[PDB]
Amino acid sequence: SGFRKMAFPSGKVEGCMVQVTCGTTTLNGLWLDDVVYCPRHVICTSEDMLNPNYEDLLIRKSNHNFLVQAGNVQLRVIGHSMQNCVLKLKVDTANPKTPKYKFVRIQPGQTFSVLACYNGSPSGVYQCAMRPNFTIKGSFLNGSCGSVGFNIDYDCVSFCYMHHMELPTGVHAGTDLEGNFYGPFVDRQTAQAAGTDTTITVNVLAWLYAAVINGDRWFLNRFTTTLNDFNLVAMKYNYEPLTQDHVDILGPLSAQTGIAVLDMCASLKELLQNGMNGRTILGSALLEDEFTPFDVVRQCSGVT
Amino acid sequence: SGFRKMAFPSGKVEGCMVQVTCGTTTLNGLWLDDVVYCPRHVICTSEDMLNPNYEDLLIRKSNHNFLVQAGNVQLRVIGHSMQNCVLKLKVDTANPKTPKYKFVRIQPGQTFSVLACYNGSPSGVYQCAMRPNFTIKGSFLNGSCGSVGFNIDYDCVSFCYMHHMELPTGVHAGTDLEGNFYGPFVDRQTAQAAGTDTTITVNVLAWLYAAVINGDRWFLNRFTTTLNDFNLVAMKYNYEPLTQDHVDILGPLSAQTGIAVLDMCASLKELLQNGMNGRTILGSALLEDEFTPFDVVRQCSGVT
Ligand SMILES: *CCC(=O)N(c1cc(C(C)(C)C)on1)[C@@H](C(=O)Nc1ccc(OC)cc1C)c1cccnc1
Numbered sequence: 001s002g003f004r005k006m007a008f009p010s011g012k013v014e015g016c017m018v019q020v021t022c023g024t025t026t027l028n029g030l031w032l033d034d035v036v037y038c039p040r041h042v043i044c045t046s047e048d049m050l051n052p053n054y055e056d057l058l059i060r061k062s063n064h065n066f067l068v069q070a071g072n073v074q075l076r077v078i079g080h081s082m083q084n085c086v087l088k089l090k091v092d093t094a095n096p097k098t099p100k101y102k103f104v105r106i107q108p109g110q111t112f113s114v115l116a117c118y119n120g121s122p123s124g125v126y127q128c129a130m131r132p133n134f135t136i137k138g139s140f141l142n143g144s145c146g147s148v149g150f151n152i153d154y155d156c157v158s159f160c161y162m163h164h165m166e167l168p169t170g171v172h173a174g175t176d177l178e179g180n181f182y183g184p185f186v187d188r189q190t191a192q193a194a195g196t197d198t199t200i201t202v203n204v205l206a207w208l209y210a211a212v213i214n215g216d217r218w219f220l221n222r223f224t225t226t227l228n229d230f231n232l233v234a235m236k237y238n239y240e241p242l243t244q245d246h247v248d249i250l251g252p253l254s255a256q257t258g259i260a261v262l263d264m265c266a267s268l269k270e271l272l273q274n275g276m277n278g279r280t281i282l283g284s285a286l287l288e289d290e291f292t293p294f295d296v297v298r299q300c301s302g303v304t
Numbered sequence: 305s306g307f308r309k310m311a312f313p314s315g316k317v318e319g320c321m322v323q324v325t326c327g328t329t330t331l332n333g334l335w336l337d338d339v340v341y342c343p344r345h346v347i348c349t350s351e352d353m354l355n356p357n358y359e360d361l362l363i364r365k366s367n368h369n370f371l372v373q374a375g376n377v378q379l380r381v382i383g384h385s386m387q388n389c390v391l392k393l394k395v396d397t398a399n400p401k402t403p404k405y406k407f408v409r410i411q412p413g414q415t416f417s418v419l420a421c422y423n424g425s426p427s428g429v430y431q432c433a434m435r436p437n438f439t440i441k442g443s444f445l446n447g448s449c450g451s452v453g454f455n456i457d458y459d460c461v462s463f464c465y466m467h468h469m470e471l472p473t474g475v476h477a478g479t480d481l482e483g484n485f486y487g488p489f490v491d492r493q494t495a496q497a498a499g500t501d502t503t504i505t506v507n508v509l510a511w512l513y514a515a516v517i518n519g520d521r522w523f524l525n526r527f528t529t530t531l532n533d534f535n536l537v538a539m540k541y542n543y544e545p546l547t548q549d550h551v552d553i554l555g556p557l558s559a560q561t562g563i564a565v566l567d568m569c570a571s572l573k574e575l576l577q578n579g580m581n582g583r584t585i586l587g588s589a590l591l592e593d594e595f596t597p598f599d600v601v602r603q604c605s606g607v608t
């Protein structure tokens with residue numbers, strides 16, 4: 001037992017981290033097969049960030065201007081192209097450590113692991129969630145750009161995020177591995193305010209199920225509710241609306257614990273209305289929303 | 305910016321995880337050089353757990369009774385010995401993925417990363433702290449025994465913990481890599497209650513410094529205190545006493561933020577006495593104590 005904010009083991013992704021330098025800017029790149037993926041803003045200088053014309057800035061760059069270093073050895077760049085907000089640098093050597101992989105674009109509410117890197121070197125790994133406003137609450141300093149988000153299913157790494165920027169509010173924005181930003185963010189130093197960071201209701205319910213499985217049952221009550229009644233309360237507290245799809249996704253957890261999904265919704269409703277009263281659930285004094293129902297099942301069953 | 309419960313990248317430790325089977329029990333082992341380390345309770349059956357005589361149980365085991373599998377290939381066991389509560393199985397092949405390593409016995413309050421494994425396969429990584437009562441609040445299911453705790457300094461892995469058991473209260477006990485348990489716990493299925501889980505004061509202060517560095521400053525007040533006054537309050541709230549050694553360890557964070565350690569203690573004192581009032585610090589509604597002052601500096605500086 002015990003429930004922890006757990007990340008996927010990062011080895012498979014560590015073997016893919018490289019350093020990409022263009023001029024004076026150095027950031028992280030992801031080396032899969034003979035391609036290195038990195039944020040296109042690696043070609044930008046001090047001025048450029050404010051109003052960059054990437055197509056124009058890219059004309060002044062040749063293959064030899066992109067310095068790619070994997071460990072302490074240099075990779076030869078034989079081609080370069082821009083796909084949306086990522087640069088793809090074709091190298092002459094396939095990464096011998098390329099795991100089986102996919103590029104996926106996740107939905108908000110979905111969780112993933114981030115391997116935070118600096119100068120192509122991994123510094124740490126943590127578990128994130130794509131917020132409903134398409135930001136991520138990460139831990140990224142200057143030079144962390146190019147660090148990636150991923151999920152692993154046995155031996156296949158599904159890359160879903162690449163770090164590009166920090167908004168003035170200390171939250172983070174990035175793209176999928178096709179270079180498309182999550183949300184409305186752009187890779188320029190301009191006024192970009194995030195929308196309402198609503199709570200991922202289905203994840204809170206999944207984590208309440210994890211708490212019951214682990215023995216924290218004080219919040220379980222004698223009440224039930226309906227999806228419509230629950231959602232009136234959820235709207236009031238800036239919680240995402242709960243749909244029949246979410247109820248279905250929670251089915252295995254409801255089955256394992258014997259607590260009907262709507263009964264857990266009524267417990268969540270009373271927690272929203274009354275607060276925790278100084279109590280904790282799974283060692284937390286707030287309702288945790290960065291565990292999906294899949295994460296709860298995986299962690300509670302020991303999927304390797 | 306942003307502050308996350310960050311683990312060390314786990315690749316170097318993933319390359320060391322093996323499966324050890326003795327009879328019907330299968331748990332995890334750590335393969336460094338030509339030795340595989342695992343909990344000695346791998347030799348125990350259903351009955352044995354209650355009152356095991358490990359020296360007697362070990363007499364009935366030969367090298368061929370220990371099945372060690374690294375990936376899908378079997379390792380040949382050429383020697384076996386018991387060192388305290390760990391078994392050391394000498395194999396005929398040195399692990400080609402052995403990183404530079406050390407075995408360290410950490411103090412309570414110190415943090416570390418755990419790579420939770422099942423059948424020698426890594427399932428997840430998370431950051432822990434050795435509690436002042438010598439337990440760890442992990443996430444471990446049956447078969448997780450032999451999973452290890454570690455810290456990394458650039459390229460050297462310092463292994464500090466090996467998982468052995470879960471106490472009836474859902475908390476975890478284990479040993480260092482020399483087989484010595486942390487705390488008074490023993491590897492037998494008996495009444496073993498944990499002591500008071502006090503809060504690691506120096507870690508809470510380090511995390512309050514991390515919050516100031518990241519912009520969460522609402523809790524900063526106009527007060528100061530002394531080590532003796534602060535400690536009277538700390539004792540009342542089951543916080544560990546703060547010593548001059550802890551104040552010295554917080555020096556770099558005090559220097560970076562310009563907030564004297566005793567001033568941060570007075571802020572912590574008011575948080576203990578008044579509570580959070582429904583507010584959060586670094587996205588948490590309670591005072592976090594699983595970040596050491598070294599972790600705060602490492603994360604805030606991007607040590608790779
Ligand atoms: C690796 C790049 C980097 O450190 N950062 C960055 C990103 C960019 C552009 C060209 C805008 C994509 O330029 N520098 C920064 C970052 O995003 N800083 C930043 C913060 C706030 C604002 O407000 C307008 C603009 C910018 C540029 C970074 C720092 C920490 C974490 N991630 C990224």
Ligand SMILES: *CCC(=O)N(c1cc(C(C)(C)C)on1)[C@@H](C(=O)Nc1ccc(OC)cc1C)c1cccnc1
Pocket residue numbers: 001331345348353444445446447448449450468469470471472491492493494495
């Ligand atoms: C990998 C071994 C295992 O799953 N567990 C275990 C440990 C042991 C001994 C021989 C006692 C060291 O036997 N089985 C269990 C575990 O420790 N279970 C457990 C819980 C509570 C009590 O109370 C008396 C006794 C025992 C044996 C395990 C389960 C989950 C996480 N870690 C370990």
